[PDB]
Ligand binder design. Structure first.
Ligand SMILES: *P(=O)(O)OCC(C)(C)[C@@H](O)C(=O)NCCC(=O)NCCSCCO
Length: 509
């Protein structure tokens, strides 16, 4: 996606357009060939990989050209193929065995529908959705060897759909309903609740998935498929879609077969693991941050959410600054957080974790599942560099780390073998992420729909900064270490670093 977004930068800058999308065709937007010499030339200076007009012909779209610049394609297995637990799923199942997460790993998705949907038709749509995505009806029961996936049959996957009347503010009820625990060995990792009442106009459709079966990118497939299925089941027929290109097990199986054994030196896993053992060498145990309380001895996993609204001219300024320096918006937001901690006394070694989506294959681009590997983006701020300088360091660190994004985070932790503490997250405690909410989801289920935020009562790490476009900043802080007022000031201080950065990126940090 980093390669993907940076290619759009050159397409729009060379073709002088604003019609640059992930699925846009270079030649289709008026693209010739000297234009490719300029586009191919610029791509070399930023990404540093060998690109040529030859690549542009084969991959004339940013999405394709990005995948071309960088492993077998996901091959759909047999109809009777058994489920296969991906290394991503193993971590999520494992985390809930070692921690009292309080549902901190339940990802919520709430939509406001102008019409109180038909709970019976909705249920049929939820049953259809679960049947389409095997990941939504796959249980993880513990055994003597390890966790074993149990793919429920469509007839046997008891879906959980129910209506819920709102008494108080639905915002706090959504958080409460979302944080309810999941029993991955007996319950499917999908929960649907239709919140209705006299205080809410129409109803609020809440989809609560456990992260083991869905990530933030699965929101679009879920809503799109639940709309497609809901509309059909409302007409007495089964929803008419074309079969899924692949299932999660197919992606996991193809991914695991290619990853190889960490003991074989020629396998991608060990060869990537080796990069990280060097890249994360002599890593800080933890950053010297300003906390309001000492690190507890138990991970309460409880936290809050401090938001900082971003003016359109500031969102527009950040995008402009990114394009000028040949860096993604994430890299800008990441440098801001790094500077913030650096200015707060963290030091010159700012290890920030970040989620990278493994959705390169076209067979899993719009599929439901968890493809987010956590990566340690180690930013060095020594030598009192300017912001534009740190944008160079960040980009190099990111692109270099993005080429080794397939080593499971848990394996990197085992390879770097860091001093551990159940109250502290390994390698990193501050996470920076850039999310985008689904667009064109305003007329779902034949009504007036609109996404609703769920107030987070939990926190996965000490500090999680999130740049969320519809844009704003969301601070997921650990309640055991930070006070809400302190988080509000910290997210606001991030905004001020961004304001100064765009205005004068030549200023020391
Ligand atoms: P611009 O759009 O005007 O430039 C177009 C170029 C020069 C890139 C190219 O499309 C062109 O004009 N001709 C390319 C045809 C060609 O000769 N390809 C070589 C492969 S043919 C087999 C050789 O063994």
């Amino acid at each position: 996606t980093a390669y993907e977004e940076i290619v759009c930068q050159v397409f729009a800058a060379v073709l002088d357009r604003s019609d640059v999308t992930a699925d846009a065709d270079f030649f289709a937007l008026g693209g010739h060939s000297l234009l490719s010499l300029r586009v191919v030339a610029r791509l070399r200076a930023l990404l540093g990989v060998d690109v040529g007009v030859r690549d542009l012909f084969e991959a004339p779209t940013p999405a394709a050209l990005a995948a071309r610049l960088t492993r077998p394609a996901v091959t759909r297995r047999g109809p009777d193929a058994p489920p296969v637990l991906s290394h991503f799923q193993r971590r999520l199942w494992l985390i809930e065995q070692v921690y009292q997460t309080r549902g901190a790993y339940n990802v919520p998705l709430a939509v406001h529908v102008s019409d109180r949907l038909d709970l019976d038709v909705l249920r049929a749509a939820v049953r259809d959705l679960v049947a389409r995505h095997e990941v939504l009806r796959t249980l993880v029961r513990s055994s003597d060897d390890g966790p074993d996936p149990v793919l429920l049959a469509p007839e046997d996957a008891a879906v959980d759909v129910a209506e819920v009347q709102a008494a108080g503010p639905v915002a706090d009820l959504l958080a409460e309903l979302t944080a309810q625990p999941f029993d991955l060995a007996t319950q499917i990792p999908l929960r649907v609740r239709m919140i209705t009442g006299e205080q809410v106009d129409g109803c609020v459709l809440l989809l609560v998935c456990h992260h083991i079966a869905a990530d933030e990118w699965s929101f679009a497939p879920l809503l799109r498929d639940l709309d497609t299925a809901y509309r059909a089941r409302a007409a007495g027929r089964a929803p008419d879609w074309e079969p899924l290109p692949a299932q999660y097990s197919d992606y996991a199986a193809t991914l695991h077969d290619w990853l190889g054994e960490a003991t074989d030196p020629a396998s991608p896993l060990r060869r990537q693991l080796d990069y990280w053992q060097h890249a994360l060498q002599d890593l800080p145990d933890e950053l010297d941050l300003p906390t309001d309380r000492p690190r507890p001895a138990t991970a309460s996993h409880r936290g809050g959410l401090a938001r900082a609204e971003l003016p359109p001219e500031l969102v527009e300024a950040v995008r402009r600054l990114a394009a000028q320096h040949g860096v993604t918006v994430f890299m800008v937001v990441q440098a801001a957080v790094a500077v913030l901690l650096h200015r707060l006394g963290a030091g010159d070694d700012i290890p920030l974790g970040s989620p990278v989506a493994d959705r390169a294959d076209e067979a899993v681009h719009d599929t439901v599942g968890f493809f987010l590997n956590t990566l340690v983006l180690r930013v060095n701020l020594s030598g009192n560099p300017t912001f534009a300088d740190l944008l160079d360091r960040v980009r190099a660190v990111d692109l270099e780390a993005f080429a080794r994004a397939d080593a499971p985070f848990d394996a990197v932790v085992d390879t770097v073998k860091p001093p551990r503490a159940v109250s502290r997250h390994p390698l990193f405690q501050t996470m920076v992420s850039y999310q985008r909410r689904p667009s064109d989801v305003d007329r779902l289920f034949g009504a007036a729909t609109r996404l609703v935020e769920v107030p987070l009562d939990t926190a996965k790490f000490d500090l999680e900064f999130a740049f969320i476009e519809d844009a704003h900043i969301a601070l997921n802080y650990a309640a055991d270490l930070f006070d809400h007022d302190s988080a509000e000031q910290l997210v606001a201080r991030l905004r001020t670093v961004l304001e100064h950065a765009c205005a004068d990126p030549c200023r020391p940090v």
